[PDB]
Amino acid sequence: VVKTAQNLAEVNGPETLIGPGAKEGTVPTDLDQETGLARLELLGKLEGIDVFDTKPLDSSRKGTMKDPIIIESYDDYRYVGCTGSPAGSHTIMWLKPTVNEVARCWECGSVYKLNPVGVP
Amino acid sequence: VHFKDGVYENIPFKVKGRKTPYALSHFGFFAIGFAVPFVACYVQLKKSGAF
Amino acid sequence: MTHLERSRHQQHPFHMVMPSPWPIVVSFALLSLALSTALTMHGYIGNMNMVYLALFVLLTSSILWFRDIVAEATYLGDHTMAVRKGINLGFLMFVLSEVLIFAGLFWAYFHSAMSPDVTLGACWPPVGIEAVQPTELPLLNTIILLSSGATVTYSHHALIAGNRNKALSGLLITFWLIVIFVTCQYIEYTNAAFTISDGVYGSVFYAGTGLHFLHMVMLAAMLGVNYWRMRNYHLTAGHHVGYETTIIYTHVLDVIWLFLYVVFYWWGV
Amino acid sequence: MVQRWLYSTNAKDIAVLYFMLAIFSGMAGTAMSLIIRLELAAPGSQYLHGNSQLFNVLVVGHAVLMIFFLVMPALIGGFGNYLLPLMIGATDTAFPRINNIAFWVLPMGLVCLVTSTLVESGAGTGWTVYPPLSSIQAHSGPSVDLAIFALHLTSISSLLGAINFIVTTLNMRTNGMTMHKLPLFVWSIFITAFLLLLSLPVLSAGITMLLLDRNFNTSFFEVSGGGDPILYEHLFWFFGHPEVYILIIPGFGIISHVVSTYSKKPVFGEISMVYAMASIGLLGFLVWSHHMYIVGLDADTRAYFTSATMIIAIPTGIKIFSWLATIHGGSIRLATPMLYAIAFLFLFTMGGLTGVALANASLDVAFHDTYYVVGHFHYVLSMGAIFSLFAGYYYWSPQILGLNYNEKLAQIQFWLIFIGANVIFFPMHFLGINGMPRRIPDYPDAFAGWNYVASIGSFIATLSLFLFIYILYDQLVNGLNNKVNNKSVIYNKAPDFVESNTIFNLNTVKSSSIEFLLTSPPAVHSFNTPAVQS
Amino acid sequence: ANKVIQLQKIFQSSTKPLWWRHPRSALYLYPFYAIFAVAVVTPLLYIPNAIRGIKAKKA
Amino acid sequence: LPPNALKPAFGPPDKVAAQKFKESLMATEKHAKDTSNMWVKISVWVALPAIALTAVNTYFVEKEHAEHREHLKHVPDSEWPRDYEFMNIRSKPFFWGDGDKTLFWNPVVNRHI
Amino acid sequence: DEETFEEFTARYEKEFDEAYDLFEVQRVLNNCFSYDLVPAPAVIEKALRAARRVNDLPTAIRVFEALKYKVENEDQYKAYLDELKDVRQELGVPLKEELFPS
Numbered sequence A: 001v002v003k004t005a006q007n008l009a010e011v012n013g014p015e016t017l018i019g020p021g022a023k024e025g026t027v028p029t030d031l032d033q034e035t036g037l038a039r040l041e042l043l044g045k046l047e048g049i050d051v052f053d054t055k056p057l058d059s060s061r062k063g064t065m066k067d068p069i070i071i072e073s074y075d076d077y078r079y080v081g082c083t084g085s086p087a088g089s090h091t092i093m094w095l096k097p098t099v100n101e102v103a104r105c106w107e108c109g110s111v112y113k114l115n116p117v118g119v120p
Numbered sequence B: 001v002h003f004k005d006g007v008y009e010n011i012p013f014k015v016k017g018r019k020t021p022y023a024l025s026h027f028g029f030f031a032i033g034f035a036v037p038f039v040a041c042y043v044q045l046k047k048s049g050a051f
Numbered sequence C: 001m002t003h004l005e006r007s008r009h010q011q012h013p014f015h016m017v018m019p020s021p022w023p024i025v026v027s028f029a030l031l032s033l034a035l036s037t038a039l040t041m042h043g044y045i046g047n048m049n050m051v052y053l054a055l056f057v058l059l060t061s062s063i064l065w066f067r068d069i070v071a072e073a074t075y076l077g078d079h080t081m082a083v084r085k086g087i088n089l090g091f092l093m094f095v096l097s098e099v100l101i102f103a104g105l106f107w108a109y110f111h112s113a114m115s116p117d118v119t120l121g122a123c124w125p126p127v128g129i130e131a132v133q134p135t136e137l138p139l140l141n142t143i144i145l146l147s148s149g150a151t152v153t154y155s156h157h158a159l160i161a162g163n164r165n166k167a168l169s170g171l172l173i174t175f176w177l178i179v180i181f182v183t184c185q186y187i188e189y190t191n192a193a194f195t196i197s198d199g200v201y202g203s204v205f206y207a208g209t210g211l212h213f214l215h216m217v218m219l220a221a222m223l224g225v226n227y228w229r230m231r232n233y234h235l236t237a238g239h240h241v242g243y244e245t246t247i248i249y250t251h252v253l254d255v256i257w258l259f260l261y262v263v264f265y266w267w268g269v
Numbered sequence D: 001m002v003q004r005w006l007y008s009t010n011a012k013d014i015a016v017l018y019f020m021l022a023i024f025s026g027m028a029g030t031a032m033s034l035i036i037r038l039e040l041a042a043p044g045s046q047y048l049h050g051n052s053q054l055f056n057v058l059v060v061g062h063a064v065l066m067i068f069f070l071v072m073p074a075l076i077g078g079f080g081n082y083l084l085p086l087m088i089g090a091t092d093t094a095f096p097r098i099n100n101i102a103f104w105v106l107p108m109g110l111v112c113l114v115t116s117t118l119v120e121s122g123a124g125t126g127w128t129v130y131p132p133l134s135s136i137q138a139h140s141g142p143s144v145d146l147a148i149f150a151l152h153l154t155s156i157s158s159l160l161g162a163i164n165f166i167v168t169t170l171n172m173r174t175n176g177m178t179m180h181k182l183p184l185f186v187w188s189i190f191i192t193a194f195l196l197l198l199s200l201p202v203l204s205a206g207i208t209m210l211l212l213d214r215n216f217n218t219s220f221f222e223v224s225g226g227g228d229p230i231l232y233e234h235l236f237w238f239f240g241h242p243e244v245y246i247l248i249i250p251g252f253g254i255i256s257h258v259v260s261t262y263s264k265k266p267v268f269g270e271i272s273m274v275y276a277m278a279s280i281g282l283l284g285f286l287v288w289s290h291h292m293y294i295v296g297l298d299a300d301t302r303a304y305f306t307s308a309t310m311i312i313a314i315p316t317g318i319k320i321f322s323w324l325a326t327i328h329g330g331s332i333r334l335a336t337p338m339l340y341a342i343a344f345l346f347l348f349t350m351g352g353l354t355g356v357a358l359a360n361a362s363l364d365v366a367f368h369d370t371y372y373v374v375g376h377f378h379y380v381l382s383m384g385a386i387f388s389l390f391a392g393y394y395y396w397s398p399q400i401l402g403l404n405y406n407e408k409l410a411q412i413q414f415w416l417i418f419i420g421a422n423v424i425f426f427p428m429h430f431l432g433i434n435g436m437p438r439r440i441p442d443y444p445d446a447f448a449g450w451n452y453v454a455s456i457g458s459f460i461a462t463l464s465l466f467l468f469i470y471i472l473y474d475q476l477v478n479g480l481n482n483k484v485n486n487k488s489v490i491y492n493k494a495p496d497f498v499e500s501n502t503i504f505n506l507n508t509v510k511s512s513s514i515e516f517l518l519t520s521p522p523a524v525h526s527f528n529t530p531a532v533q534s
Numbered sequence E: 001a002n003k004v005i006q007l008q009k010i011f012q013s014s015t016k017p018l019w020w021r022h023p024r025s026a027l028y029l030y031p032f033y034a035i036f037a038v039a040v041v042t043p044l045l046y047i048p049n050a051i052r053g054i055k056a057k058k059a
Numbered sequence F: 001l002p003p004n005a006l007k008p009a010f011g012p013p014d015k016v017a018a019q020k021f022k023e024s025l026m027a028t029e030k031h032a033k034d035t036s037n038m039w040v041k042i043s044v045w046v047a048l049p050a051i052a053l054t055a056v057n058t059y060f061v062e063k064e065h066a067e068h069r070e071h072l073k074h075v076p077d078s079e080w081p082r083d084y085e086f087m088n089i090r091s092k093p094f095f096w097g098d099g100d101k102t103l104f105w106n107p108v109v110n111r112h113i
Numbered sequence G: 001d002e003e004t005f006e007e008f009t010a011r012y013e014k015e016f017d018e019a020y021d022l023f024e025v026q027r028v029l030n031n032c033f034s035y036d037l038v039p040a041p042a043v044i045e046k047a048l049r050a051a052r053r054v055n056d057l058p059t060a061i062r063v064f065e066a067l068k069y070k071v072e073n074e075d076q077y078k079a080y081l082d083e084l085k086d087v088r089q090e091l092g093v094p095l096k097e098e099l100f101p102s
């Protein structure tokens, strides 16, 4: 009933992350016997997509209450470390915007808003 | 593994809702620490014939 | 994969190990070993049967710990790119510490030899001591070791290239070459004219080359573990970390033995 | 419950076990120093019935417990395992099962050292264990073996933990945090982890070779087979000095956080603080034979070690002036952690200046085995590293536990240990300069004066420790009430001058590290979506 | 032969602890626990003699 | 069900980076072929002939030492050379066997008199 | 940071005109009094006219309280109260000593 996923759009949970075994007499390939989170990170590499987020904070401008800086999260909160508009302008200040309250920097006045995308 | 959260949940010992007072555990634990040098002295002075 | 599906998978690549009994079972075997050896070295225990049992339990309890790392990487998929990079870096810091253990044994050798003590005869080696000659059975050993660092190189590159038979043969040969080195030191020991009891010379000599002997027995156990895993299809052409740690091991032990052979055999004799 | 605390793979739970064992061990090591100071109160046999072997046994037990079973499992095993993953955004440590074995070897190393004092006569050798006094001719039976196995088990602990600390810092930092952006406390555990990795294997060579002389008929150090006792001292002291710095640098990083928080100013010259911590960790491998100035080394060997020892005063003095520059022009808040940090700056400077005199080989002829040396290293270890351990507990425990402590009771505790520590150790310099040797249970009658004064201060300081044990009880039973009455401090930073009371309630915390932004008792799953900084 | 994929699905759908999922794991874990108990108790039963100075009469 | 439940989580795929990754799995696959093939040649044209001539040279030198062991086995203990002060140290007997012999003790060549 | 005094006033004058709520007026005011200088009279006037625009009287009282902490003498405090005479009178701002007289 279940079958091996071929691309990121075919992944439906962890039972589609089990590959086809190598046949007798040959050296196994990565695509033949990887599983789990290690296999999901490989399917993204083949298409050119990074499945783990590693980019730093957006310091292009200073958010305001009218036009804040949107921050995405898979929970109700995220920790944010602000150092000023051109990164490194002032000493770092850690904040925690939540789904009910924005965060403002007491040092520079930058405003950060949350954007929840997680699904229980 | 999933654990609980709260105030008295991240320690290995029980402080509330217990039958015996917590003072017997708290000061009994630190009494045994303070008392091991004296047990050593007793054994060795009982070997030299001082006792 | 939308937002709904991405929620079912981790947001970071690092490995969350489940609780295990092994770390606290290894600690108890370590205390049973310490208490038994001190008690038998001083006569409170009649024989060596309790020391034997404590060594057997320290051994089979590390096996089970290693058995649970195989399953977490071959059957569960928990070794992502970041987990793999951390494992390699932890192993390099392990060998750096083991290298400095030999560095302390080379200090003790040079301290005893550059200004030798007068009860020896103020001469190195001391009078009456017949030492091991370099151009001998120790010269067969330095060739047998250099010959295994090139048969292990072509096995590793035959696995990346997808050749199975060539990979499986260049490892079965590295195994029996380290085995040959081990029994060659055994012959060299039961025939030597001096003993570890023969003063400070027999102490620094058998300590430096005797520790290296023990690592080689550990090195031959690692190549046998890789042999089972490569023959039973655990290792893939791009994911074989239990193999690279073994390869780095055979090259450091090669350099250490090279130093032993130049100082303990050519300069100190 | 069984598998949460015996099978643990969580770095916060393991750090709590470390602190529990560390504080149970300082009880025993303080009880031994009290028995020692009662027997030194007056000339003659006092309490031990003339058993000089027993007095020597308690001195070894005192030093081993304080160093290897209190200060290392608390500053490193405790605070390092709890605050380092949280300060860099890590979800755990690397190698969580290695992290657990490095704790469970310390209980087994305690049931090896304790049973060493109860078997035959114990080990009356000093904590350095020099041969031939520690060989089977002058120390028969299994006591010195069981003490060596105890030291072996603490080396496995510290080495395995150091490998874990190094990989975690280099591999598991969060988005945007580069090595130039680390908090100063993270730098102090990282540099300490490298000193342990390069010095512990030399000590394991020395004491395993001592075990071989005793039981396997070997002559590394035996003089009848050609061996040399002076080799052991080179091998032991090549680990020793790096150890004293493995004990002060984590406290250097604690002092940096406390002083900056209660000044409302960032640390002055933060980048030159990391360069100084690295220079002190490097120069601590080139100075070890200042501990062997009178054993007969060459005069040109002794002139090198003089100048090498002196130049470690330059980087350390940069850290002293840097700390005084951040509190200058500040807004100082005199809570309990701030009191210890200000006493650290005054009492560490004194202990370090008596080390500069000891650094010259010509003057060390009048300073060998003299109480004057004992006075030097109790000013930098007991008014130094110990004072930074109190500063840490009062700084982070309300967050870690969710429970507040009685503030005015804690300021009484601080003054009782500041007064009592000075009374024990200041007259030790007077005894040494007049010529009193160390490691003696009995002395000539002219030394009775200052020896009585120091024994009184030993009772003052033990009473201050018993008050700390009650403060722990009050925090654990009444911690939630300490938040609603006015018996404790709620905010370590107060509103700014022009900031109103209600604007302050929008952002209560103004922190430059993550740890003060978590829930009070931090969640067992602290990060799911990674933290991000610019 | 190759049994990676088959063991891959046994392991990932099991409720038991990690060291218990393989069908052959009973044969290792039962005798190890008994041996582990003897190897811990027996050295402890000798500290009373060591404190009392009684030595074994292997003669 | 939040409204965001059915919206993309990654963004536009990078087809350039998908090719750099793809081309690097074939370069290393074949670079390991031109590298592996040489080390089989080296292992048979240098390493193997070294373990050939050294072995017989080692057999010859070892064969001589066996007769020298046979002559010593006939020497009685009366004219065995006397030990020096540092030889055969016994600070306390070994805790195994008779208390006088080491692990690799050989009666022909090692003696305590 | 090489900023002359003349550049200091012209930058904080611009910064007080853009503040749009109480959080902004209090945050800008905090940073202006945190240097090693006393702001010029023309900067104090713009800070009073910024707290009027957000309708907050205590922030305007605290402006003169910080001024009496930062000066070196009490004759420097007086000369400010003699320059900003009309503005304190036109907006109706009292002094903290006048409000809680002792």
Ligand code: HEA
Pocket: D023, D025, D026, D027, D030, D033, D036, D037, D059, D060, D062, D063, D066, D067, D071, D074, D126, D127, D128, D374, D378, D381, D382, D386, D389, D390, D393, D421, D424, D438, D439, D440, D458, D461, D462, D465
């Ligand atoms: C960690 C190091 C440390 C510490 C803290 C101490 C603390 C003390 N030491 Fe000792 N001492 C040594 C290390 C230390 N010492 C060493 C290495 C030697 C040499 C051994 C040798 O000669 O072989 C020595 C030797 C030594 C001697 C020499 C004896 C002789 O030569 O034979 C004497 C004599 O009085 C002495 C006294 C004391 C006293 C009175 C204290 C007391 O003043 C302690 C005062 C303060 C406290 C009571 C401790 C705090 C309590 C805790 C439990 C902390 C808990 C904190 C938290 C968890 C937040 N010490």
Ligand code: HEA
Pocket: D244, D245, D247, D248, D290, D291, D309, D310, D312, D313, D314, D316, D317, D318, D320, D348, D349, D351, D352, D353, D355, D356, D358, D359, D360, D364, D367, D368, D369, D373, D376, D377, D380, D381, D384, D385
């Ligand atoms: C925390 C532990 C610790 C620390 C940090 C130190 C720090 C120093 N120590 Fe110490 N020491 C010990 C623990 C420690 N020591 C122990 C336990 C022993 C005895 C071991 C035993 O025998 O059991 C010992 C013994 C010992 C000896 C051996 C003496 C002997 O046994 O006879 C020497 C020799 O030079 C020494 C010197 C120094 C010096 C120069 C420093 C320097 O790092 C100090 C530098 C600091 C300053 C100088 C203060 C601030 C500087 C300035 C403000 C700059 C301006 C100053 C000038 C221009 C001068 N101490």
Ligand SMILES: CCCCCCCCCCCCCCCC(=O)OC[C@H](COP(=O)(O)OCCN)OC(=O)CCCCCCCCCCCCCCC
Pocket: B011, B012, B013, B014, B015, B018, B019, B020, B024, B025, B026, B029, D015, D016, D019, D020, D078, D079, D082, D397, D400, D401, D472
């Ligand atoms: C003796 C009492 C038995 C009563 C008989 C049972 C009848 C029902 C009574 C109910 C009580 C149940 C008894 C269970 C045992 C128990 O709850 O307290 C008993 C526990 C013992 O057990 P333990 O799990 O801690 O292990 C340890 C066994 N060796 O004492 C204690 O540790 C007291 C310890 C308190 C001191 C620690 C202070 C540290 C505070 C944390 C700060 C951390 C800072 C971290 C910074 C890095």
Ligand SMILES: CCCCCCCCCCCCCCCC(=O)OC[C@H](COP(=O)(O)OCCN)OC(=O)CCCCCCCCCCCCCCC
Pocket: C101, C189, C190, C191, C192, C193, C194, C195, C196, C197, C206, C207, C208, C210, C211, C214, D152, D204, D205, D206, D208, D209, D216, F102, F103, F104, F105, F106, F110
């Ligand atoms: C904790 C970190 C470890 C630091 C270790 C520093 C010092 C280690 C150096 C010694 C290592 C063992 C030497 C090899 C044995 C040897 O010596 O070779 C064997 C020698 C040579 O035979 P022979 O004398 O009969 O002469 C031959 C004439 N026919 O016989 C003996 O010795 C007999 C005594 C047994 C020695 C065992 C000592 C074990 C204690 C140390 C255990 C190893 C340390 C931990 C290693 C993982």
Ligand SMILES: CCCCCCCCCCCCCCCC(=O)OC[C@H](COP(=O)(O)OCCN)OC(=O)CCCCCCCCCCCCCCC
Pocket: C055, C058, C059, C062, C066, C069, C070, C073, C074, C079, C087, C218, C221, C222, C225, C234, C235, C236, C239, C240, C241, C242, C243, C245
């Ligand atoms: C007397 C008692 C002594 C006991 C000591 C026994 C030592 C013998 C050596 C046995 C090693 C077996 C390891 C195989 C585990 C494995 O499976 O490693 C393979 C795993 C899986 O990755 P993969 O690439 O296969 O992925 C498969 C495709 N996806 O990767 C790793 O974990 C790398 C880490 C391995 C490091 C092992 C530890 C080495 C140091 C231990 C030293 C202990 C003694 C020190 C004494 C001074």
Ligand SMILES: CCCCCCCCCCCCCCCC(=O)OC[C@H](COP(=O)(O)OCCN)OC(=O)CCCCCCCCCCCCCCC
Pocket: C015, C017, C026, C062, C065, C066, C069, C072, C087, C090, C091, C094, D094, D095, D096, D097, D098, D099, D156, D159
């Ligand atoms: C007295 C005689 C001397 C005995 C020596 C002491 C014996 C104590 C340890 C017993 C071996 C049990 C196996 C545990 C090791 C392990 O399993 O390493 C395997 C760990 C597992 O990682 P993980 O499970 O934590 O993460 C989960 C990820 N899957 O891979 C690593 O960390 C990577 C780095 C390898 C470094 C291993 C170092 C070897 C440990 C011995 C060090 C001893 C130093 C002192 C030398 C004298």
Ligand SMILES: [Ca+2]
Pocket: D039, D040, D041, D042, D043, D044, D045, D046, D441, D442, D443
């Ligand atoms: Ca006395």
Ligand SMILES: [Cu+2]
Pocket: D240, D241, D244, D288, D290, D291
């Ligand atoms: Cu030193």
Ligand SMILES: [Zn+2]
Pocket: A082, A083, A084, A090, A093, A105, A107, A108, A109, A110
């Ligand atoms: Zn900001």
